[PDB]
Short mmCIF file of C-alpha atoms in Angstrom, two decimals:
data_model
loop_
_atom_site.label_atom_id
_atom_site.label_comp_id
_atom_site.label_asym_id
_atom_site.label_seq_id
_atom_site.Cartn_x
_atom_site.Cartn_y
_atom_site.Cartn_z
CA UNK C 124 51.80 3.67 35.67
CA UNK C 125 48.31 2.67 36.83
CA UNK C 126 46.09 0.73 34.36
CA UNK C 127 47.43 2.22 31.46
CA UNK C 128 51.05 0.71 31.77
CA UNK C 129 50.23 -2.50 33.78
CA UNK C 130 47.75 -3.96 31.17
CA UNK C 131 50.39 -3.01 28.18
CA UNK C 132 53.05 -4.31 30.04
CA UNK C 133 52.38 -7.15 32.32
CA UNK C 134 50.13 -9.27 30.78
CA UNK C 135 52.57 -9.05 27.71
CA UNK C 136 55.41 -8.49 29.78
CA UNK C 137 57.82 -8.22 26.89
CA UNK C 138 56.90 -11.20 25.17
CA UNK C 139 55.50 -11.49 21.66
CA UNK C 140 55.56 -13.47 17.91
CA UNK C 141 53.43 -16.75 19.10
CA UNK C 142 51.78 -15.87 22.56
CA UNK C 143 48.70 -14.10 22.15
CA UNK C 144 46.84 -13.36 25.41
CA UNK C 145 42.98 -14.06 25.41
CA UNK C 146 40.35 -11.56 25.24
CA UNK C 147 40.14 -8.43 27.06
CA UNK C 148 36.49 -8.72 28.97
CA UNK C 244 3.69 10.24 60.61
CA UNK C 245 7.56 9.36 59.58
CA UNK C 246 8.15 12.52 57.46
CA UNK C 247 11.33 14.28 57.24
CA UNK C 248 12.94 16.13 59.93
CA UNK C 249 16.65 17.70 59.46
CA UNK C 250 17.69 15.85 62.85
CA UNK C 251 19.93 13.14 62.42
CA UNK C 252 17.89 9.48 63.45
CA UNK C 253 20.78 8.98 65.34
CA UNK C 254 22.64 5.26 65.71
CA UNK C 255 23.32 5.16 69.06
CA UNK C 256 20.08 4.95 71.39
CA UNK C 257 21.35 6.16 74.33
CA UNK C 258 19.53 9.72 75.05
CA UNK C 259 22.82 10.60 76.61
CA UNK C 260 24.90 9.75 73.45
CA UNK C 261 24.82 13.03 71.60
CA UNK L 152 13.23 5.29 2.57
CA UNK L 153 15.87 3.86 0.43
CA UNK L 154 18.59 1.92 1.00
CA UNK L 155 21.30 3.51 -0.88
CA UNK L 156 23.66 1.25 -2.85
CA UNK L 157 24.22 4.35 -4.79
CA UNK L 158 25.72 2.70 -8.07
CA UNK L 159 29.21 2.42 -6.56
CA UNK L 160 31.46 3.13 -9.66
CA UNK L 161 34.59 2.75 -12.46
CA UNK L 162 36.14 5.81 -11.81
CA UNK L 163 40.00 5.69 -13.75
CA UNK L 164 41.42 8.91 -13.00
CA UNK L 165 45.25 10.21 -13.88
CA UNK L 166 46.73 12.43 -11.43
CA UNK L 167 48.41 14.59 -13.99
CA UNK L 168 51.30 16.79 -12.04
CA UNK L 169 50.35 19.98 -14.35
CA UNK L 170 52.64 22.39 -13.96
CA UNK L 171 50.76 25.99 -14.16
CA UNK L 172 52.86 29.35 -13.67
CA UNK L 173 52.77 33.20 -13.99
CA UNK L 174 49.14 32.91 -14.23
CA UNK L 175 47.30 35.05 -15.97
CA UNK L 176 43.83 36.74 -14.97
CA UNK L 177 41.32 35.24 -17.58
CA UNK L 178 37.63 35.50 -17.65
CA UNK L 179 35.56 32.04 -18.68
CA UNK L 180 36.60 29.70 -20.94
CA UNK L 181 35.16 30.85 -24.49
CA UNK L 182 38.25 33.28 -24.45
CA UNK L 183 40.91 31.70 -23.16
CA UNK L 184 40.73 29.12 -26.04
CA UNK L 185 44.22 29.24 -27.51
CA UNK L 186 43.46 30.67 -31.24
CA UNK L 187 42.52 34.05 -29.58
CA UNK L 188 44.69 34.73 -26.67
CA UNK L 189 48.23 33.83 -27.40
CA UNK L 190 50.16 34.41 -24.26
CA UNK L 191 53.78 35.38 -23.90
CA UNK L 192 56.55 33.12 -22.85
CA UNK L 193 56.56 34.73 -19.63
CA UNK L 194 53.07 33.70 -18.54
CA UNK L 195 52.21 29.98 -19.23
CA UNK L 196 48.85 29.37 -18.26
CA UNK L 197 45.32 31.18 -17.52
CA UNK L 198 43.24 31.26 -14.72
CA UNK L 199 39.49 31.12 -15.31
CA UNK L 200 38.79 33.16 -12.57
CA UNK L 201 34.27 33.26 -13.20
CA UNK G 4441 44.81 -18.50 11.35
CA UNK G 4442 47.51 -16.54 13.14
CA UNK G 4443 48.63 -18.82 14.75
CA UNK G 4444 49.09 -21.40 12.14
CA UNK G 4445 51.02 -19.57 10.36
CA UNK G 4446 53.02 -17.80 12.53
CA UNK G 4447 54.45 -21.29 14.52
CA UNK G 4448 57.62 -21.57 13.84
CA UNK G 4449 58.06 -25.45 14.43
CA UNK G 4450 55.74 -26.18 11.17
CA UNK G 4451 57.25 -23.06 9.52
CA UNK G 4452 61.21 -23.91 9.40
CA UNK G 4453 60.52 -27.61 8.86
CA UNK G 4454 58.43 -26.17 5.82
CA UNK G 4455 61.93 -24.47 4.83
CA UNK G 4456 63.70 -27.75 5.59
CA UNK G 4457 61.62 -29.42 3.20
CA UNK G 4458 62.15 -26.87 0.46
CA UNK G 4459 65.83 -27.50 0.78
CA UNK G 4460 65.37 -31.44 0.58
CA UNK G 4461 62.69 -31.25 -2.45
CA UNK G 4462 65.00 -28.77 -4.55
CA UNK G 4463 68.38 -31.39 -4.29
CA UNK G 4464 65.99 -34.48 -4.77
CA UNK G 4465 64.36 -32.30 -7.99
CA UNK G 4466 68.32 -31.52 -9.15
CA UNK G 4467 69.48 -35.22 -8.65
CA UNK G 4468 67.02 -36.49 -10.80
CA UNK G 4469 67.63 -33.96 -13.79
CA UNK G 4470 71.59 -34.67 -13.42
CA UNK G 4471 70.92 -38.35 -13.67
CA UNK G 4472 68.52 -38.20 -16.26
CA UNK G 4473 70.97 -35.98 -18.83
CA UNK G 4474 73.39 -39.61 -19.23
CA UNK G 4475 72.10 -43.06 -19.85
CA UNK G 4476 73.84 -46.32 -18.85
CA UNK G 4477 75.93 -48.18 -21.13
CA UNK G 4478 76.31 -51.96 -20.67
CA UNK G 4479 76.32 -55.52 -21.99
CA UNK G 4480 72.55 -55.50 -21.47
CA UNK G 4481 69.11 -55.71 -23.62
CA UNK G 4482 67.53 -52.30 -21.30
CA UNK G 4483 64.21 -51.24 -21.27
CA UNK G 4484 62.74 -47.48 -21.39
CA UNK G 4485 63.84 -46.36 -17.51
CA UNK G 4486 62.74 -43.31 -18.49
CA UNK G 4487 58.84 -43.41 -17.01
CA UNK G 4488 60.29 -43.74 -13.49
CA UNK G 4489 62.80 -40.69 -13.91
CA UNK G 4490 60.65 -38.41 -15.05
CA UNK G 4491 57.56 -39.69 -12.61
CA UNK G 4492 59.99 -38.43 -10.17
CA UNK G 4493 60.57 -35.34 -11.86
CA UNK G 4494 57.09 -34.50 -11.73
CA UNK G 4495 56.52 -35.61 -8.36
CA UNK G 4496 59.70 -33.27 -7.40
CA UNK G 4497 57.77 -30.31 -8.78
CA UNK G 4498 54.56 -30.87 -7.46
CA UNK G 4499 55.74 -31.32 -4.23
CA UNK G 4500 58.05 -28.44 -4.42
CA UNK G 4501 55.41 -25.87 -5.06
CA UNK G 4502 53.29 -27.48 -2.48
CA UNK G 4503 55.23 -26.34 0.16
CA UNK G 4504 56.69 -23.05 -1.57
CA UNK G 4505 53.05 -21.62 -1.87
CA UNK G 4506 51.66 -23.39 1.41
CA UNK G 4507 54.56 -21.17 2.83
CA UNK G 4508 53.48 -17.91 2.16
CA UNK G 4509 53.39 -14.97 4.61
CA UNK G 4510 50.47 -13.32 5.23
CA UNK G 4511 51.02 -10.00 4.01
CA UNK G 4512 52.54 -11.18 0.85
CA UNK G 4513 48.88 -13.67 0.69
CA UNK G 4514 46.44 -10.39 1.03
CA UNK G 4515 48.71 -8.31 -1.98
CA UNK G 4516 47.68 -11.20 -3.79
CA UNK G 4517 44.52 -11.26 -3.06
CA UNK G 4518 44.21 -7.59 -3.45
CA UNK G 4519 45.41 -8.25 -7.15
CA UNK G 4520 43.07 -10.43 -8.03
CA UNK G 4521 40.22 -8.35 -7.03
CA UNK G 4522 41.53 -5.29 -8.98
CA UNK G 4523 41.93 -7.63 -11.57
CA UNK G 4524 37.96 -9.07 -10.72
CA UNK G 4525 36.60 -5.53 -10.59
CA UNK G 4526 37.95 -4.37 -13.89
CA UNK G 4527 35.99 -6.48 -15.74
CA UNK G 4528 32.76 -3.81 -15.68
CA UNK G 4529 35.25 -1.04 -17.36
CA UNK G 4530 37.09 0.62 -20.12
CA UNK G 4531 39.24 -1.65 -22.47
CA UNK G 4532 42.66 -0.02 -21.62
CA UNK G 4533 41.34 -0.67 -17.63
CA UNK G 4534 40.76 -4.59 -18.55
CA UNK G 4535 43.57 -5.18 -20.56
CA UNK G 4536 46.36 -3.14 -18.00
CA UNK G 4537 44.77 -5.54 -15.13
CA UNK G 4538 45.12 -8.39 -16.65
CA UNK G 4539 48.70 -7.28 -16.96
CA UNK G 4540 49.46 -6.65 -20.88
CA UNK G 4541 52.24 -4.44 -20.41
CA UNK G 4542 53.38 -3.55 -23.57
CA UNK G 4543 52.06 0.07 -24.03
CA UNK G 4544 52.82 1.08 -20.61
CA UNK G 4545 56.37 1.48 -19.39
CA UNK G 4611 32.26 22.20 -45.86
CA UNK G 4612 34.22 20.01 -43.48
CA UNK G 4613 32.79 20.76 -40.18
CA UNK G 4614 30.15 17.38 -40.26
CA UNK G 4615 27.61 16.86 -38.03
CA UNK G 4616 28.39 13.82 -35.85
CA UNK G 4617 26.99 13.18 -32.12
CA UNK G 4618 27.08 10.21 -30.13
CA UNK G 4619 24.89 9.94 -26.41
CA UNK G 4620 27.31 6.94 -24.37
CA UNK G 4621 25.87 4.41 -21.71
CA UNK G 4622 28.82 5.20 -18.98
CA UNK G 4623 30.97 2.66 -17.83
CA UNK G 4624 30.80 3.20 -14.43
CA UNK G 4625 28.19 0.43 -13.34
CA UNK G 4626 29.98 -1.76 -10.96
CA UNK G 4627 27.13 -4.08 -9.69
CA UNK G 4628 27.04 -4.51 -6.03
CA UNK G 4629 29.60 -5.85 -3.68
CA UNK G 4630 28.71 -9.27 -3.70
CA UNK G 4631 28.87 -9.67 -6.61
CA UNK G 4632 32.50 -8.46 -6.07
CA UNK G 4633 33.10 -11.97 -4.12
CA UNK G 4634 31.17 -13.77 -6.84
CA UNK G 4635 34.26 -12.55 -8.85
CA UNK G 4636 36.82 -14.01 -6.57
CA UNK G 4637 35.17 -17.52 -5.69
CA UNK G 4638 34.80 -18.71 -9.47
CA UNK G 4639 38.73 -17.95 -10.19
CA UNK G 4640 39.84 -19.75 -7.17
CA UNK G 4641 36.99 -22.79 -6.73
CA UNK G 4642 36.65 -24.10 -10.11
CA UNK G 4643 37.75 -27.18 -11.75
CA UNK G 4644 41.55 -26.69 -13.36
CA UNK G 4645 42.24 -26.47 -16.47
CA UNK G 4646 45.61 -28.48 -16.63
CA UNK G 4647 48.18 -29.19 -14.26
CA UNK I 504 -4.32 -20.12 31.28
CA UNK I 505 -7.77 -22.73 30.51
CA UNK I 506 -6.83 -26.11 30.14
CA UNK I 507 -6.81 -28.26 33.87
CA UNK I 508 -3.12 -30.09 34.04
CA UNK I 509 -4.21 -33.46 32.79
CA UNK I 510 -6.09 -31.49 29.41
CA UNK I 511 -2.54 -29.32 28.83
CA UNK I 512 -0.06 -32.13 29.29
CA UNK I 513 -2.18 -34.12 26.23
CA UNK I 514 -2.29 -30.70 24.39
CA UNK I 515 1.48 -29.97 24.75
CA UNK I 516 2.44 -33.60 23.61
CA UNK I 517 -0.36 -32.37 20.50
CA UNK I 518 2.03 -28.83 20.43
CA UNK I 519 5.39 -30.42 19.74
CA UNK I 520 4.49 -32.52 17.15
CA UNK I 521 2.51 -29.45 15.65
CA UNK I 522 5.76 -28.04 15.53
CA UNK I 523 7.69 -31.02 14.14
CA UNK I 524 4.99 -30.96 11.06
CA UNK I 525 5.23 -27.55 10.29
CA UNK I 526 9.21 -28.16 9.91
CA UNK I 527 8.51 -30.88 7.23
CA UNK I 528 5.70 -29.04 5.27
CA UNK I 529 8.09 -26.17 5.26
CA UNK I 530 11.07 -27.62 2.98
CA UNK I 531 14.45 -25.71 2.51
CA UNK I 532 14.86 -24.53 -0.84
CA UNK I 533 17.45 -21.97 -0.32
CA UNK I 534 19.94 -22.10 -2.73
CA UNK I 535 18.68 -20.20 -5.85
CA UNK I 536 16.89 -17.42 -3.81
CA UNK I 537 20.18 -16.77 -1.97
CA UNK I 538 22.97 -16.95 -5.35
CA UNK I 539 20.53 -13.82 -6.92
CA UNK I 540 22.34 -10.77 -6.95
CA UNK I 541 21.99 -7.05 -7.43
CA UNK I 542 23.68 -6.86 -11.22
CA UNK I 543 21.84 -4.92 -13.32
CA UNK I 544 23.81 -2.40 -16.12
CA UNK I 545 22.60 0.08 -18.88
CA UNK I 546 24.70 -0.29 -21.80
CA UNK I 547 24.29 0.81 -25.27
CA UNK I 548 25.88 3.15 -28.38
CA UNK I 549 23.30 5.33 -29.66
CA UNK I 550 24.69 8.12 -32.05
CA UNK I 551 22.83 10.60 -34.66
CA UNK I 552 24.64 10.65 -37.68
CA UNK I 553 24.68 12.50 -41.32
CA UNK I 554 24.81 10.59 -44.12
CA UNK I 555 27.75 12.34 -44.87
CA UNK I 556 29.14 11.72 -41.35
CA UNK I 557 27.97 7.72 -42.15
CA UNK I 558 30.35 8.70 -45.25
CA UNK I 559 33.53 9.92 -43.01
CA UNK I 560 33.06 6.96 -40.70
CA UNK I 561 33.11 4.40 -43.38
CA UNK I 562 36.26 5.94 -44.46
CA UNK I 563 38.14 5.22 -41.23
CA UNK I 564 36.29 1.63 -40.74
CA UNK I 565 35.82 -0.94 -43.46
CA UNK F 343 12.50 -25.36 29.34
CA UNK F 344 11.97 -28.47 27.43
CA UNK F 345 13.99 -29.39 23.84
CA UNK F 346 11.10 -28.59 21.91
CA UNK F 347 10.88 -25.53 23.38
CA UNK F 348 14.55 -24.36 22.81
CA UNK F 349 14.17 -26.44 19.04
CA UNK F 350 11.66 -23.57 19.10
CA UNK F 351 13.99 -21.06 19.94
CA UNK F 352 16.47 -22.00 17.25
CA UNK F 353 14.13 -21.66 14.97
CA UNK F 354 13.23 -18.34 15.56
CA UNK F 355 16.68 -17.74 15.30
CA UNK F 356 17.40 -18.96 12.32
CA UNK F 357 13.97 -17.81 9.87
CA UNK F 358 14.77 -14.37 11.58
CA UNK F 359 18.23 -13.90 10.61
CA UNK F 360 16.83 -15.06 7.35
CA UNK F 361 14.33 -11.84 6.98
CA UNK F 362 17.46 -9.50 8.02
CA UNK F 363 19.02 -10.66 5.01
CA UNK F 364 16.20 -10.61 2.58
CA UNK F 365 15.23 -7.14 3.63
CA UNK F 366 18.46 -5.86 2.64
CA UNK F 367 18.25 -7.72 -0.71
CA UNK F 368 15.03 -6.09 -1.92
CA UNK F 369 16.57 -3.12 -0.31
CA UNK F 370 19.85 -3.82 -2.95
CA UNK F 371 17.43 -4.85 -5.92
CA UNK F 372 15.36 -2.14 -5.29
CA UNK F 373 17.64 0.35 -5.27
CA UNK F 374 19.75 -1.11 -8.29
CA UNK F 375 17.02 -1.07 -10.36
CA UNK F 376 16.58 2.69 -9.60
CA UNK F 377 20.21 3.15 -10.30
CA UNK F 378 19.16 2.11 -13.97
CA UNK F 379 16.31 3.73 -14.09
CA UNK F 380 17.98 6.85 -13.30
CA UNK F 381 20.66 6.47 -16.01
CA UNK F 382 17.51 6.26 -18.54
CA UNK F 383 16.35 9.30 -17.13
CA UNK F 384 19.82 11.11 -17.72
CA UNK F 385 19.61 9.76 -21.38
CA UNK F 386 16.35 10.96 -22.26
CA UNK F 387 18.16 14.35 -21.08
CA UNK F 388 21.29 13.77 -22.71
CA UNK F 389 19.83 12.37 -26.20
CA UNK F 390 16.75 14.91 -26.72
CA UNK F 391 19.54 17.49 -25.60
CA UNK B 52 57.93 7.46 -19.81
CA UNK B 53 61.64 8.92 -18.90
CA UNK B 54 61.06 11.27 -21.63
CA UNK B 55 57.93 12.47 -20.26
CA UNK B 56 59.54 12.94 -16.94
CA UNK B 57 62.48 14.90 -18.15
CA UNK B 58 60.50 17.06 -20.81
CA UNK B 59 58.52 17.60 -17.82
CA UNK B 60 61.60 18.85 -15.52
CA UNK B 61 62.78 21.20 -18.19
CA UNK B 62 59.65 22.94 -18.78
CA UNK B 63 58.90 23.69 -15.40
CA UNK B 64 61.51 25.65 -13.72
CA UNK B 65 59.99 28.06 -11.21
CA UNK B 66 56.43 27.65 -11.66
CA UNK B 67 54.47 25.58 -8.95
CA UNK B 68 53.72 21.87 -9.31
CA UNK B 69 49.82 21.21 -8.91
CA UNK B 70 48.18 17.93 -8.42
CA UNK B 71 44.72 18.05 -10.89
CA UNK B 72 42.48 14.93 -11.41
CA UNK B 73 41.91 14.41 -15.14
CA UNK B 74 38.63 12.10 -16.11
CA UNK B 75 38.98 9.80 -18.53
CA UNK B 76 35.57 10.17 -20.36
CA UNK B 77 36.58 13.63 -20.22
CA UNK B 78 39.47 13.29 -22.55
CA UNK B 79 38.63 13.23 -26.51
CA UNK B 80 39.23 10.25 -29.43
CA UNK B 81 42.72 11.74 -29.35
CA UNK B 82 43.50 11.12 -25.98
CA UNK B 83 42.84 7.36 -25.92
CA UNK B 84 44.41 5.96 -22.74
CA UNK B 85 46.59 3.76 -24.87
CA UNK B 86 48.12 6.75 -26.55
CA UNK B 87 49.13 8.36 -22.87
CA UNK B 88 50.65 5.53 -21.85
CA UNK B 89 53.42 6.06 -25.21
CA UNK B 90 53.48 9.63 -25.44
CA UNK B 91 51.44 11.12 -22.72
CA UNK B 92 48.61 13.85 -22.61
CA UNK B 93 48.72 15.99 -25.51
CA UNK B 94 47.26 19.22 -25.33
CA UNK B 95 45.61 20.75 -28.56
CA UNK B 96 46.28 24.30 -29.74
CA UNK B 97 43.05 25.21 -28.26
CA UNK B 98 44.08 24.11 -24.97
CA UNK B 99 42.61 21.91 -22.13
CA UNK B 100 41.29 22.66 -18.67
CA UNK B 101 42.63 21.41 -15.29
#
């Protein structure tokens, strides 16, 4: 289904002949982790 | 450089349906000229081939 | 445009209105093929029978043409511009587009000729300048 | 960028009606330089003929 | 933002779409008169031939 | 023309049908495009190319 069958279908939805929808649209790198938690303990 | 209109044209064609069979082999078109080939029944047309 | 022409309210009342021109245009030719015979000095009556003739064939091709679908509007139009673009070519292309339909259903002198081809075709605006001069100017007659 | 605030504001009133003169000493001709089209075609009959061909074409003509 | 400033605006607008079509006009002209010139080119070929 | 479609039919029997494009500057005084239209394209006894 997915976008391809619920644009074609749904916002025409069957109707037709009079409707017409509208338009269509120090600091430098170390491999450690910095980590988030600042326990000491945490890791 | 140039804008090319390229003198669109009048071109009046007629798709003629010609009806060519049993072909045969010719060289250019100074001897397959009618007064000095004179083909059988069989074979009904001639293919310039060069 | 679409949707203009595509509504069906305006489009059936423009077929109910063919049907009502058409009898008022055959009433008025029935009653204009007998006159009235009495014990009376009559005038002409004949202006006002046949002012309604004309205005039930005016308004009859009002509508009939105004009511025309789309696709049968751009063949039309397609004709006329074959008919617009043959103009600029050979006289068996000019007169076949502007219908004329009757066709279709010691001695070895030195002659040469050197031929301007017909195969000009000015550009394609001047194509429109074709189609806006049979369309937009004055009538001829009525 | 030069003029103080009090200097611009009398030079931008100038401005606007520099640009309102330049739209009447401008015009609007259009028209005829728009209706001129690209139609231009070579057209012609140009033929060498003998006198005696002149003779065989007379006899088909007039 | 003032409505001499965007009467300025429309007229760039407007003279500008007016030089897109005039360049492609001397481009057509140009080119059309080329076209001829080019069948009197194939004539002097054709009628010296 | 009916008669240029039947001729046509008869001729051809088991020969192929092509499709050629025929010019019509290429075609001679003879070959006026009024005359095809009321008796068709009529080949010389020299003979003509498609």
């Amino acid at each position: 289904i997915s976008y391809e069958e619920t644009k074609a279908l749904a916002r025409f939805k069957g109707r037709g002949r009079e409707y017409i929808p509208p338009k269509l649209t120090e600091e430098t790198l170390t491999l450690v982790h910095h980590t988030a938690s600042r326990n000491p303990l945490s890791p | 450089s140039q804008l090319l209109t390229g003198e669109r044209r009048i071109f009046e064609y007629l798709l003629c349906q010609v009806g060519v069979g049993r072909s045969v082999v010719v060289e250019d078109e100074k001897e397959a000229c009618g007064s000095r080939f004179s083909l059988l029944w069989e074979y009904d047309s001639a293919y310039l081939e060069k | 445009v679409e949707m203009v022409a595509r509504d069906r309210r305006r489009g059936k009342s423009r077929q109910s209105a063919i049907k009502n021109f058409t009898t008022l245009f055959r009433r008025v030719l029935s009653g204009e093929k007998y006159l009235l015979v009495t014990q009376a000095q009559y005038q002409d009556s004949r202006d006002q029978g046949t002012r309604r003739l004309l205005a039930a064939v005016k308004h009859t091709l009002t509508v009939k043409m105004c009511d025309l679908s789309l696709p049968i509007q751009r063949a039309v139009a397609y004709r006329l511009y074959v008919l617009c673009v043959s103009q600029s070519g050979s006289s068996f292309l000019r007169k076949l587009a502007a219908m004329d339909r009757d066709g279709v259903m010691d001695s070895e002198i030195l002659s040469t000729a050197v031929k301007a081809d017909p195969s000009s075709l000015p550009s394609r605006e001047h194509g429109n300048l074709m189609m806006t001069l049979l369309v937009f100017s004055p009538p001829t007659s009525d | 960028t030069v003029l103080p605030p009090a200097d611009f504001l009398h030079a931008w009133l100038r401005h606007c009606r520099l640009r309102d003169e330049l739209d009447a000493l401008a015009g609007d001709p259009s028209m005829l330089s728009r209706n001129v089209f690209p139609d231009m075609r070579l057209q012609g009959r140009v033929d060498i003929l003998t006198d005696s061909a002149l003779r065989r074409r007379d006899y088909v003509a007039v | 933002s003032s409505p001499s400033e965007e009467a300025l605006l429309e007229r760039r607008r407007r003279i500008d779409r007016e030089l897109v079509e005039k360049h492609r006009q001397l481009g057509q002209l140009h080119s059309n008169f080329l076209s001829v010139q080019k069948r009197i080119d194939e004539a002097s070929k054709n009628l010296v031939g | 023309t009916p008669h240029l479609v039947s001729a046509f039919e008869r001729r051809t029997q088991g020969r192929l049908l092509t499709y050629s494009f025929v010019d019509t500057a290429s075609l001679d005084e003879d070959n006026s495009l009024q005359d095809i239209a009321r008796r068709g394209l009529k080949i010389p006894m020299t003979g003509m190319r498609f």
